Point group: D2
Chain length 427, copies 4
Amino acid sequence: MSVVGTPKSAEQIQQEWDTNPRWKDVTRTYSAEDVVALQGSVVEEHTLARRGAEVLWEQLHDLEWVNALGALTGNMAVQQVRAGLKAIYLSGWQVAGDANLSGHTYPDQSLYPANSVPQVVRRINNALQRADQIAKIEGDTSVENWLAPIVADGEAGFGGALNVYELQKALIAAGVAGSHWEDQLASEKKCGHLGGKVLIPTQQHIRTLTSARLAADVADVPTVVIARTDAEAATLITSDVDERDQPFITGERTREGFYRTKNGIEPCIARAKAYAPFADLIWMETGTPDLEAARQFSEAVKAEYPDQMLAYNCSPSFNWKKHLDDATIAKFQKELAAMGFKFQFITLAGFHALNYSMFDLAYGYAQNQMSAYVELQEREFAAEERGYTATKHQREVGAGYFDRIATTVDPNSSTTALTGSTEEGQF
Amino acid sequence: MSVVGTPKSAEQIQQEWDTNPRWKDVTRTYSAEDVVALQGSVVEEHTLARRGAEVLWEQLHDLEWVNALGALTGNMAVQQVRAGLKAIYLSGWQVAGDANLSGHTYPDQSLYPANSVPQVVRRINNALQRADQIAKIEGDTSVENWLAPIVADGEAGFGGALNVYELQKALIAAGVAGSHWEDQLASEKKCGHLGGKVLIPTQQHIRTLTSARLAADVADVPTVVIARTDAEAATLITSDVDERDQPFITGERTREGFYRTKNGIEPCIARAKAYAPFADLIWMETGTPDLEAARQFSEAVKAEYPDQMLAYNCSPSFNWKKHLDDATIAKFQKELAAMGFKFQFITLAGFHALNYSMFDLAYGYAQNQMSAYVELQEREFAAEERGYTATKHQREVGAGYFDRIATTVDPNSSTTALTGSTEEGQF
Amino acid sequence: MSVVGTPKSAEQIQQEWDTNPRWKDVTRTYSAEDVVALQGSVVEEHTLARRGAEVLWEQLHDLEWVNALGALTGNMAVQQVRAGLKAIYLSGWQVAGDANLSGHTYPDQSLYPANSVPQVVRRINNALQRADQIAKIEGDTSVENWLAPIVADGEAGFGGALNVYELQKALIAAGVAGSHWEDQLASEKKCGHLGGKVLIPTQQHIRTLTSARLAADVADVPTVVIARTDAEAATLITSDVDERDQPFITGERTREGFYRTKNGIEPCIARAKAYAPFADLIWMETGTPDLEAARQFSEAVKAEYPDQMLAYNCSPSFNWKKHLDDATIAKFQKELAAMGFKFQFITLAGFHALNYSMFDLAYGYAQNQMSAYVELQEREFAAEERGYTATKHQREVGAGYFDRIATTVDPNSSTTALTGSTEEGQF
Amino acid sequence: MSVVGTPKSAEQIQQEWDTNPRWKDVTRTYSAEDVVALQGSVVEEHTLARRGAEVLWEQLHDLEWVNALGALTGNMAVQQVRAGLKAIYLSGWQVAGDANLSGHTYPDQSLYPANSVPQVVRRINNALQRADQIAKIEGDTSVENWLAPIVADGEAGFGGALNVYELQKALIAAGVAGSHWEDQLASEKKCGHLGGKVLIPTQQHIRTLTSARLAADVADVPTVVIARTDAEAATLITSDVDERDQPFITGERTREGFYRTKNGIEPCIARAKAYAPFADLIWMETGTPDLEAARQFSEAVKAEYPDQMLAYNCSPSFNWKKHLDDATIAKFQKELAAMGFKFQFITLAGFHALNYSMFDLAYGYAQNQMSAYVELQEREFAAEERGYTATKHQREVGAGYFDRIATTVDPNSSTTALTGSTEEGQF
Ligand SMILES: [Mg+2]
Ligand SMILES: [Mg+2]
Ligand SMILES: [Mg+2]
Ligand SMILES: [Mg+2]
Ligand SMILES: [Mg+2]
Ligand SMILES: [Mg+2]
Ligand SMILES: [Mg+2]
Ligand SMILES: [Mg+2]
């Protein structure tokens, strides 16, 4: 007795893959019965993972494109949604630099503990849930969906296929909507715009993508799976065993045993085609934001997979006005969307906004003390016309929500917070 | 047979208390032998807590005053130090709101797990230590002390005197320089600029301050101990047992058994005088920024304790161009300093800089996409003249430092990170 | 536009309260509308919390009684379930001593971080899920329900009603089936069998029980709520404000402001009746294991609440053969069940089993080296006839399950773990 | 202007390397100035790591041999020291299976987050420090050194040389005395007695051991570095690039690009010799417990390095009486010690002691209820003559130590724990 969490049958899963348009052109090299064999006798429901992934998939098909900014704190995601954005990007670079479970500042080389990104996903969802709870008790209808989908960095999976599986499962438990996975050797992982990258064989990354899909299937959620290739700049590969990689092997070896390979858009197109049956979106890391190179990649991939959606990193590692003029910057995302780049994001937006704004404030305070803080406060007061609410800082973090819990439990409590506050009297 | 970490003798501890000027006018109601009894057979050295506390104490006597801004991420603290600040303030409000170990957004009511602030202390010290490491390999000498002392919020101690002891011990293990403790009931704790606060008896907060000094003594570091009183606004107190509180008890008693009490500056002055023998700095929570009230509080405390240093929260819970003209705003901290307010801080500075800068960026991104980010990138480029370094983000999170480790281990490595990067090629 | 996780209407909730026999004689002093107001626009499903609470409630009515042992690691809980037990008890004492998030060894005085017990609940559920997954791939049907319900220690809620609310919420997220709450002052919390206990007013504990029910309702799960009274040995109380508490107040007060109160079974009976409308189970902490005293308490409460179910701590803080003979010990739990004690548990069973087994092994090892280990290994081999499986330690921690994942992703993998193992070769 | 934590000069470090016998026959391929360059301007003192490493090294020379049992909780370590052991072994296998930061049960394949073993190091040290504090206030001198050295599992580094560096640094911050490192591919890590192990080239493990020594030098502590080789059973290697590995390459390759290689004692001996200049102890993982195979390994290494100390895993993965008689079992460790195996350990002792004791208790409890627990409590009472103390569980976890803290803060407090307890009244 008790049927809570009973797993679906293999036939139900198979019928869903056979008939739901979500799974059009999605290859699974394992079976529905393989999935059920791994589920035990109770499947935990992952509400935020399910809802986020369904919302993301529909926005990728209903909006001209979905764009996002890198968030590394929960308040930062709340402001992104308040300001109108409809998805959140969770950067692994930013987690390494300023939000991972070791407590350390790291460059983007897979140095932090592998459950760090799941913990930030959970944090972001907690923060959006609080904003949603506050808005409900305030009757604030100005944001349609506080639970914007989160797209998170799975890096190179922190090891083998089993590490990929466990990371994807942990991201789902935390409520992620989509995750991306790149074809680098995890032990030598680099930021796509850092040097010295080592690729893994094409088939090994297909194994990674298959493992990420399997973890989503076993968890019963339709997570958006994104394949990333680092072959534009990488000049090293671990092995020449894969026949699709051999055209680019030069035969030269390094002291460590790696193989030198010829980099460029050509191996990226070849890998993207190989990954397409296994990814919902395909992403080419690139050293410069270049509309023409984007079109060449876009058109080469859609020659084979006309419906394949693409993702694009508008990266802060680029110096945007020493390779482009203002008119191209202003149309950049709109043109990319027309080539099929349906998910576009600024990875390190949060790092730069956080670091610049604290430097600016702290430098003024160093010279002029309170005059510098009053400047920022006036800018916040101004931003209230645009919908900024964090000026009322007590309600922003839920003081009114917890007052409501308190008076629900005890309508006659003499210790409520907002009653008799300096926010109630000066703001 | 090793002697590493052997504890000092009671006689050496006592000499220290008797002759070191650091302990002039510090009351310890326990004995030096009581400290040794609690130390087991090994005392861990706490390098950063020791150095931070020593630097903080010297700064409070050598500078006209020490000021700080609330920091809630490691990168924030690094930019405050890069911008010239000589201390870091760690707000519990900000930890409740955006950085605690529950992962939830909370109002400032002691809801988060008790080891959350120590974890942020440790993170900030990790971040400063990386900034210091990078500066050394780069030959950067533009900041004399990267390891700025950290003053952290101990709230109401999260329980009784034993919870206070464990919190102080964890803050020291993490490297804090100073900590502050308030005379609020922990189970009903509220932001000073919140309403309906409940005070504890004067002697009970003396027990808290004594427990905080004991933990520092048992840890063998000279932590700066700050006493905060919440009596200006609180109209409730847990008990009338203490004869020093009785002049303000009305005799009315609420449904929960709290006693109503007369608030204002007179109970604050009484409590500050009771706390002075047990605190290195004294802090009155205040309901508006007001030079004349601060003057009255200062002169009343210094009539009985001329050497007592005071602390002042310049709080963001206030509207500054509301009350004050620009000239008062511009002189506010200097004026407070001449009155003995030697530690001054903006508690929620990190909350406001973070939330406003991301709202501002996301709002522009939602309308103009890349044009909004370029505006931010160009302000960052412009700030480089004032010393901002985070534009080169790979270097900023230590890619150059970890390249140095890699080539120390293997000088012939072909997988180092800065060579070939877009940061070398475009910045 | 997604409907995933849409909250129910107040109308629906009200009807469930009015018609589900689960809620017979459960008093809620708030409204269905109050619950819906707190739920935001998405309610996360809590599968393990729902299933466990449901299974627990059914067992409490279908079995003669439910008994459990304290578990402080996931492996301990797996062995309890393997051995036949149908519930798991999660001791806060055991968490304080050996399994809390500060990493410190503490006595049972609410010293550890308030999210420690939720993390162990999550751990235990993870461990039982792994045993469930392993059982499925091995075709083992000897255990009917691997996901045994977990009853966890809420202590005194770590502060006020809002701290209770957050702890119950975190327990439910982690998958708990029931939680217990005691009428002690959190800042002076003690193990029930320690001295120096301080009660809070009867009505304050009703507020605690109400806050815990409210969190369960807002989380949409029928969590079992257990009230515990410490009035048998406590001689202090925070306040004489509650008229139900005044008959035991002696008039004498302490320097902290506490009131002496007359302890024993009589205030226990009175508090149990006051708590009965707000608790699914009622528990009296007692000073000795005594059937006569258990009968007096049971008869007194059931004289007013004939159907009220009770809980009993068979405590290791008792010296058992100093109070009872072998016959009484053998009948103890069965006699208790006939008096209405439907949940019985040995709180510190894991602490004693863990400490004794390791002392015994280590002592023999210090003397006879490998001969002592072989003794343990042969007892292990012998216990396999009773159903013990941990002697094959690789499959016990999921080597076979993760092998199945690996071959599902890539059936031709040459790096699977159990083929070639010494376990396959020697066991 | 503080001197706390000032780094040593290069000349000072070099003089230590040249003249301290600790460093006789220790190769460092980097310079003293390289160490200094990585230290920033403050070196944190790591008291427990320094003391533990110094105690361990002395014991390895003074005792006939050092032996230990695997510990996965702090209380297990306490009992091992109370029983007379002088080192603690911290098994990664046990951390995977029941004590890692993901909360999941895992097989031994480097699946858990990379900071998990450091957290358990820190937990064990906290547990031993508390036992040391309790012993000091109880006047108990029966155990000479409560802070027994911890030897912890660094597995395969969780990635590359920078991951190794950060793990060693985290283990040292937690207080480890020694750490061991194995020549397996981290992404395909197995337990030494699982199948499907992949080796890395000899020079790559030298890189690992160099990185581990580098982190200890930068941390300014003499950590014991242990090299483990898995070449006895592994039939795969990532690359044939290293001429020392080529004699064992067969030529053929797997689908994934691995090279088949000839396993056995012969490649272990060659690897042990290559590692010896970089390891304080050397360890070959074996398939069966075999004194003459151990002699062969020992003689072979010492033919080139007569002073090289060896370590030996007395593994539970062996069925002991399916290989040896009782006389050989009885003399096994003594015989190994005479061959130079100075560190000997039972890796999974804590796993088996924990799982067996809780299975046995729960099994009796399910059938006989209190009868089963009283049998355990009686064995505990009878063990007090051998020195067992945990029967008095309140004092065991520090209730008397925290009472002393409480009475140091307030000697007249009315809320101390041990007076009035059932422990004082029944034990
Ligand atoms: Mg990344
Ligand atoms: Mg596709
Ligand atoms: Mg605060
Ligand atoms: Mg003073
Ligand atoms: Mg308890
Ligand atoms: Mg009831
Ligand atoms: Mg291991
Ligand atoms: Mg050597």
